Amino acid sequence: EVGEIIIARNRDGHFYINAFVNNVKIKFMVDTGASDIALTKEDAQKLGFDLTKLKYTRTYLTANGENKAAPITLNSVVIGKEFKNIKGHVGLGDLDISLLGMSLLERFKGFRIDKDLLIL
Amino acid sequence: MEVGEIIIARNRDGHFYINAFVNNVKIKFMVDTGASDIALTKEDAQKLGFDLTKLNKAAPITLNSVVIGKEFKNIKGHVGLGDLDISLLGMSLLERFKGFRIDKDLLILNYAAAL
Ligand code: NA
């Protein structure tokens, strides 16, 4: 179970974990802002989702336009523990890398960030 | 880049077990530091596509990918003909990154996962 996870803040000012979503290594920007696990259309398609078969029931509206998005449920998400059926979505917006958000983070217990170091 | 603790609780039956995704299939390993290889049962072996019609001693294997919370890539092991009731996770794997200890019924694995 569980873990103290520590994440050396990347060059670009964020940092990224790798999770095995349905044992596909997806690279995730760790985002407390994000509500759940926002899958880029690439990583959607990489996870064998059919972008023409998804129900795009949600809409992120940004400065530069609408970005429809599709609710899904990740069956397995392994950072090491396997979390089952973690709520996320497939963002057809300009969502250029995938998000590891609160849908996954709420299941933790304790938290701290910055200098260059996101601890869980 | 990333550094975590898997904490494993000891079974009542006096053994620590890890489930792992070897080449995307979930095998059940009992942790045996008195084993050097990953020893797979023939049953676990064939789950992974090992052809038992090829063939006590042992058949050498190399697992492309083993996920615990880090992906461990290319792990040496063997299929146990005869003995293995359960598959063994030996040092071939545990050595593979960064530290671990049995505590008062708590194996804490510690891994390090680059970018
Ligand atoms: Na990882």
Side-chain angles (χ1 to χ4, degrees):
Chain A
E1 274 205 320
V2 298
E4 187 170 60
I5 313 301
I6 314 169
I7 311 181
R9 197 205 204 77
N10 201 230
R11 289 198 73 158
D12 78 287
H14 309 92
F15 218 16
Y16 312 98
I17 340 192
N18 299 283
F20 303 94
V21 181
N22 304 333
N23 222 252
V24 150
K25 193 173 203 160
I26 295 314
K27 314 217 166 186
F28 275 121
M29 194 199 78
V30 198
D31 205 32
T32 29
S35 35
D36 57 348
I37 290 171
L39 282 178
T40 68
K41 57 161 269 175
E42 58 149 315
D43 296 314
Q45 225 135 53
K46 175 180 177 190
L47 296 148
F49 281 107
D50 192 346
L51 269 46
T52 51
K53 296 186 170 164
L54 294 171
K55 251 267 86 183
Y56 292 89
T57 72
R58 271 179 56 198
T59 292
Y60 285 83
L61 302 173
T62 309
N64 294 110
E66 206 209 50
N67 302 270
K68 44 176 179 174
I72 58 83
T73 281
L74 298 178
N75 215 1
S76 166
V77 175
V78 193
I79 330 282
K81 166 130 76 191
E82 191 206 355
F83 294 101
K84 296 284 206 156
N85 297 304
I86 293 305
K87 93 190 173 77
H89 67 81
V90 184
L92 142 163
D94 205 52
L95 217 107
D96 302 333
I97 192 157
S98 286
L99 302 173
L100 195 162
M102 287 305 317
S103 175
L104 185 19
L105 307 165
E106 57 129 284
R107 280 155 148 99
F108 293 106
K109 5 63 178 77
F111 186 60
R112 150 169 170 170
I113 345 182
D114 206 316
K115 181 50 260 101
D116 286 332
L117 208 286
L118 342 178
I119 300 164
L120 289 268
Chain B
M1 185 272 228
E2 165 212 347
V3 171
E5 293 152 340
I6 318 293
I7 296 142
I8 299 144
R10 185 210 230 73
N11 214 229
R12 288 174 65 183
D13 88 353
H15 294 128
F16 290 95
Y17 297 115
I18 321 163
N19 296 283
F21 297 77
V22 184
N23 304 333
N24 311 326
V25 175
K26 197 174 191 186
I27 314 301
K28 192 161 179 188
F29 288 108
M30 177 196 74
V31 173
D32 200 353
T33 44
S36 48
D37 285 5
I38 287 164
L40 301 175
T41 50
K42 302 170 263 176
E43 219 266 69
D44 287 330
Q46 186 167 61
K47 233 137 138 196
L48 308 166
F50 187 88
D51 185 349
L52 279 43
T53 72
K54 267 38 170 176
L55 323 190
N56 288 332
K57 211 202 175 135
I61 62 166
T62 291
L63 303 165
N64 200 59
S65 145
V66 174
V67 168
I68 319 264
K70 177 182 155 169
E71 182 163 42
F72 296 107
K73 289 280 219 174
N74 289 311
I75 317 308
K76 276 45 174 167
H78 75 273
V79 303
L81 202 179
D83 203 25
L84 264 59
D85 307 77
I86 195 170
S87 285
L88 306 178
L89 194 156
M91 307 309 315
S92 59
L93 176 60
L94 296 163
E95 84 192 335
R96 289 299 254 81
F97 252 34
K98 293 299 201 86
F100 86 88
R101 55 201 166 187
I102 291 171
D103 209 344
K104 307 185 179 188
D105 299 8
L106 285 165
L107 179 61
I108 318 97
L109 298 160
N110 306 260
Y111 64 89
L115 30 87

